[PDB]
């Protein structure tokens, strides 16, 4: 399948694409404003994620640091990223469908549209100035708006036991982005798409 990753923000990002224990495609790439990067993701993938990283440095050996979303100091992500990272999430072809979501469960760093490029299903978006508004205790020095499980490490925020409810903090993300997951047991805003669909991830969409 095909992921076209478009940086419509006015600042550079360092896109990432991982499943957890391996890169997707080249696993990351710099994207100056306006630049695009189309990747190939193997059918049937489970639990894939796409995110932006901000304020990176990488050397020629591809080794470095980012202020949001860092995946173990590399340019070419093979793990997932350090919060706060807004997340495009997907598992493809799982019995005839595709399932797409955007998640604020690790926080928010960059606004995002995740829309299908082939018919049958609706996209999802979180474009609101979450970082402009972010509750004071959840702000991240380095940039972005952290989730409460990251800031406080409690069972209730982290839903450790599989039981938890919404919180004042989950609800701050759900007031600003109702289509994105705001905590682990949020009512699912998942989208089911035809198996083998293609997609576009647009950062800073309304930019």
CSV table of C-alpha atoms in Angstrom, one decimal:
chain,number,residue,atom,x,y,z
A,1,UNK,CA,0.0,0.0,0.0
A,2,UNK,CA,0.7,3.6,-0.5
A,3,UNK,CA,1.5,6.3,2.2
A,4,UNK,CA,2.2,9.8,0.9
A,5,UNK,CA,3.4,11.9,3.8
A,6,UNK,CA,3.0,15.7,3.1
A,7,UNK,CA,4.7,18.6,5.4
A,8,UNK,CA,2.2,21.5,4.9
A,9,UNK,CA,3.6,23.1,8.1
A,10,UNK,CA,5.9,26.2,7.8
A,11,UNK,CA,8.6,24.5,9.8
A,12,UNK,CA,10.6,21.4,8.9
A,13,UNK,CA,9.6,18.0,10.3
A,14,UNK,CA,11.3,14.7,10.4
A,15,UNK,CA,8.7,12.2,9.6
A,16,UNK,CA,8.7,8.6,11.1
A,17,UNK,CA,7.1,5.4,10.2
A,18,UNK,CA,7.4,2.3,12.5
A,19,UNK,CA,5.6,-0.8,13.7
A,20,UNK,CA,7.1,-1.2,16.7
A,21,UNK,CA,10.2,-3.4,16.1
A,22,UNK,CA,11.2,-2.4,12.6
A,23,UNK,CA,11.1,0.5,10.3
A,24,UNK,CA,8.4,1.0,7.7
A,25,UNK,CA,10.1,1.8,4.3
A,26,UNK,CA,13.1,3.9,5.1
A,27,UNK,CA,11.7,4.7,8.7
A,28,UNK,CA,12.0,8.3,8.5
A,29,UNK,CA,13.0,11.3,6.4
A,30,UNK,CA,13.4,15.0,6.7
A,31,UNK,CA,10.7,17.1,5.2
A,32,UNK,CA,11.2,20.8,4.7
A,33,UNK,CA,7.8,22.8,4.2
A,34,UNK,CA,6.0,21.7,1.3
A,35,UNK,CA,8.0,18.4,0.7
A,36,UNK,CA,6.4,15.0,0.4
A,37,UNK,CA,7.6,11.5,0.9
A,38,UNK,CA,5.7,8.5,-0.5
A,39,UNK,CA,6.3,5.0,1.2
A,40,UNK,CA,5.5,1.5,0.7
A,41,UNK,CA,3.9,-0.5,3.5
A,42,UNK,CA,3.7,-4.2,3.3
A,43,UNK,CA,0.1,-5.7,3.2
A,44,UNK,CA,-1.6,-6.9,6.4
A,45,UNK,CA,0.5,-4.7,8.6
A,46,UNK,CA,-0.4,-4.5,12.1
A,47,UNK,CA,-0.3,-1.6,14.4
A,48,UNK,CA,1.6,0.8,12.2
A,49,UNK,CA,2.3,4.3,13.2
A,50,UNK,CA,3.3,7.6,11.5
A,51,UNK,CA,4.4,10.7,13.3
A,52,UNK,CA,6.4,13.9,13.0
A,53,UNK,CA,9.5,14.8,15.0
A,54,UNK,CA,10.5,18.3,15.7
A,55,UNK,CA,13.7,20.3,16.3
A,56,UNK,CA,16.1,17.3,15.3
A,57,UNK,CA,19.8,17.1,14.5
A,58,UNK,CA,21.3,14.2,12.7
A,59,UNK,CA,24.7,13.5,11.7
A,60,UNK,CA,25.9,11.7,8.6
A,61,UNK,CA,25.8,8.7,10.3
A,62,UNK,CA,22.1,9.4,10.8
A,63,UNK,CA,22.5,9.7,14.6
A,64,UNK,CA,21.1,12.4,16.6
A,65,UNK,CA,18.3,13.8,18.8
A,66,UNK,CA,14.9,15.4,18.4
A,67,UNK,CA,13.0,17.5,20.9
A,68,UNK,CA,9.8,15.7,20.2
A,69,UNK,CA,9.3,12.1,19.0
A,70,UNK,CA,12.7,10.8,19.1
A,71,UNK,CA,13.0,7.1,18.3
A,72,UNK,CA,16.3,6.1,20.0
A,73,UNK,CA,18.4,8.8,18.5
A,74,UNK,CA,18.2,7.7,14.8
A,75,UNK,CA,17.0,9.3,11.6
A,76,UNK,CA,15.5,6.1,10.3
A,77,UNK,CA,13.1,4.9,13.0
A,78,UNK,CA,12.9,1.3,13.7
A,79,UNK,CA,10.9,1.8,17.5
A,80,UNK,CA,8.3,4.1,18.2
A,81,UNK,CA,8.8,7.7,19.3
A,82,UNK,CA,9.1,9.6,22.7
A,83,UNK,CA,6.0,11.6,23.6
A,84,UNK,CA,4.6,14.0,22.9
A,85,UNK,CA,3.8,12.7,19.5
A,86,UNK,CA,0.5,13.0,17.6
A,87,UNK,CA,-0.1,9.6,16.1
A,88,UNK,CA,-1.5,8.3,12.8
A,89,UNK,CA,-2.2,4.6,13.5
A,90,UNK,CA,-3.2,1.8,11.2
A,91,UNK,CA,-3.6,-2.0,10.8
A,92,UNK,CA,-4.2,-3.0,7.2
A,93,UNK,CA,-6.1,-5.9,5.5
A,94,UNK,CA,-7.0,-7.7,8.8
A,95,UNK,CA,-9.6,-10.1,7.5
A,96,UNK,CA,-11.1,-7.5,4.3
A,97,UNK,CA,-10.6,-4.1,5.9
A,98,UNK,CA,-8.3,-1.5,6.9
A,99,UNK,CA,-8.6,0.5,10.3
A,100,UNK,CA,-7.3,4.0,10.7
A,101,UNK,CA,-7.1,6.3,13.6
A,102,UNK,CA,-5.4,9.3,15.0
A,103,UNK,CA,-4.4,9.1,18.7
A,104,UNK,CA,-3.6,11.9,21.4
A,105,UNK,CA,-2.8,9.1,23.9
A,106,UNK,CA,0.9,10.0,23.8
A,107,UNK,CA,0.3,13.5,23.5
A,108,UNK,CA,0.2,16.0,20.7
A,109,UNK,CA,3.1,17.8,18.9
A,110,UNK,CA,1.9,18.5,15.3
A,111,UNK,CA,-1.6,18.9,13.8
A,112,UNK,CA,-2.5,16.2,11.4
A,113,UNK,CA,-4.9,15.0,8.7
A,114,UNK,CA,-5.0,11.2,7.9
A,115,UNK,CA,-7.3,10.8,4.8
A,116,UNK,CA,-7.8,7.9,2.5
A,117,UNK,CA,-6.5,8.4,-1.3
A,118,UNK,CA,-8.6,5.6,-2.6
A,119,UNK,CA,-13.1,5.6,-2.2
A,120,UNK,CA,-15.2,4.1,0.6
A,121,UNK,CA,-14.1,5.5,3.8
A,122,UNK,CA,-13.7,9.3,5.4
A,123,UNK,CA,-10.4,10.5,6.9
A,124,UNK,CA,-9.7,11.7,10.4
A,125,UNK,CA,-8.0,14.9,11.7
A,126,UNK,CA,-6.8,16.8,14.7
A,127,UNK,CA,-5.9,20.3,13.7
A,128,UNK,CA,-6.7,22.4,16.8
A,129,UNK,CA,-3.6,24.7,18.8
A,130,UNK,CA,-3.5,22.0,21.4
A,131,UNK,CA,0.2,23.2,22.3
A,132,UNK,CA,-1.4,26.9,22.5
A,133,UNK,CA,-3.6,25.9,25.0
A,134,UNK,CA,-2.3,22.9,26.6
A,135,UNK,CA,-2.8,22.7,30.4
A,136,UNK,CA,0.1,24.0,32.4
A,137,UNK,CA,1.6,20.7,34.0
A,138,UNK,CA,1.2,18.9,30.6
A,139,UNK,CA,3.5,21.3,28.6
A,140,UNK,CA,6.7,19.9,27.2
A,141,UNK,CA,9.7,21.9,27.5
A,142,UNK,CA,11.0,20.7,24.4
A,143,UNK,CA,7.7,21.4,22.6
A,144,UNK,CA,4.2,19.9,22.5
A,145,UNK,CA,1.5,18.8,24.9
A,146,UNK,CA,2.1,15.6,26.9
A,147,UNK,CA,-0.5,13.1,27.9
A,148,UNK,CA,-1.3,12.7,31.6
A,149,UNK,CA,0.1,8.9,31.6
A,150,UNK,CA,3.5,10.4,30.6
A,151,UNK,CA,3.5,13.2,33.1
A,152,UNK,CA,2.0,11.3,36.2
A,153,UNK,CA,2.4,7.5,35.7
A,154,UNK,CA,-0.8,6.5,37.5
A,155,UNK,CA,-3.1,3.5,36.9
A,156,UNK,CA,-5.9,5.8,36.2
A,157,UNK,CA,-4.2,7.9,33.5
A,158,UNK,CA,-2.3,5.0,32.1
A,159,UNK,CA,-5.3,2.6,32.4
A,160,UNK,CA,-2.9,0.1,33.7
A,161,UNK,CA,-5.5,-2.5,34.9
A,162,UNK,CA,-7.7,-2.2,31.8
A,163,UNK,CA,-10.1,-0.1,33.9
A,164,UNK,CA,-10.2,3.7,33.9
A,165,UNK,CA,-12.4,6.6,33.0
A,166,UNK,CA,-12.0,9.9,31.3
A,167,UNK,CA,-10.2,12.6,33.2
A,168,UNK,CA,-9.8,16.4,33.2
A,169,UNK,CA,-6.9,15.9,31.0
A,170,UNK,CA,-8.3,13.3,28.6
A,171,UNK,CA,-11.4,15.6,28.2
A,172,UNK,CA,-8.8,18.8,27.3
A,173,UNK,CA,-7.8,16.5,24.2
A,174,UNK,CA,-11.3,15.3,23.3
A,175,UNK,CA,-12.5,19.3,23.6
A,176,UNK,CA,-10.2,20.1,20.9
A,177,UNK,CA,-10.1,16.9,18.8
A,178,UNK,CA,-13.2,14.8,19.2
A,179,UNK,CA,-12.1,12.5,16.2
A,180,UNK,CA,-8.8,11.4,18.0
A,181,UNK,CA,-8.4,9.0,20.9
A,182,UNK,CA,-8.1,11.0,24.1
A,183,UNK,CA,-7.3,8.1,26.5
A,184,UNK,CA,-6.8,4.3,26.3
A,185,UNK,CA,-10.5,3.3,26.7
A,186,UNK,CA,-12.0,6.1,24.8
A,187,UNK,CA,-15.0,5.2,22.6
A,188,UNK,CA,-13.2,4.2,19.4
A,189,UNK,CA,-13.0,6.8,16.6
A,190,UNK,CA,-11.5,4.2,14.4
A,191,UNK,CA,-12.3,4.2,10.7
A,192,UNK,CA,-12.7,1.0,8.7
A,193,UNK,CA,-11.5,1.2,5.1
A,194,UNK,CA,-11.4,-1.4,2.3
A,195,UNK,CA,-8.4,-3.7,2.5
A,196,UNK,CA,-5.4,-2.4,0.5
A,197,UNK,CA,-6.4,1.2,0.5
A,198,UNK,CA,-3.9,4.0,0.1
A,199,UNK,CA,-3.6,7.1,2.3
A,200,UNK,CA,-2.2,10.6,2.7
A,201,UNK,CA,-0.9,12.0,6.0
A,202,UNK,CA,-0.9,15.8,5.9
A,203,UNK,CA,0.9,17.7,8.7
A,204,UNK,CA,-0.2,21.2,9.6
A,205,UNK,CA,-3.2,20.7,7.2
A,206,UNK,CA,-4.9,23.9,7.6
A,207,UNK,CA,-1.5,25.7,7.1
